[PDB]
Structure 1
Amino acid sequence: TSGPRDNNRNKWAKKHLKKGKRAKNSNFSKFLKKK
């Protein structure tokens, strides 16, 4: 099985970070940031 150094695994991990899967962290940061 491909490891974590895999360039593919890095690529779709980047794809996850490119979409709303990290938008739950943006608004999460904004909540404390505003309060």
Structure 2
Amino acid sequence: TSGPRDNNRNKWAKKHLKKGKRAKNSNFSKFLKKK
């Protein structure tokens, strides 16, 4: 199986990031940030 530098895997990792996955992370930062 391919490693972590697999170009296709890095493409798929971006697709996770470009959805709610990175999102959930942004406002989760915003909560503690406005605290």
**TM-score, normalized by length of structure 2?**
0.88
Gaps of 5+ in 1: none
- Cα distance in structure 1, aligned partners of 2:34 and 2:23: 16
Gaps of 5+ in 2: none
1:22 Cα deviation (Å)? 1.0
Greater share of residues in helix: 2
- Cα distance in structure 2, aligned partners of 1:21 and 1:29: 13
The percentage of aligned residue pairs carrying the same residue is: 100
- Cα distance in structure 1, aligned partners of 2:14 and 2:24: 16
1:8 Cα deviation (Å)? 0.4
Runs of 4+ displaced beyond 6 Å: none
Residues 1-35 of structure 1 show CA distances to partners (whole Å, capped at 9, x for unaligned) of 01111000100001100000111101100001101
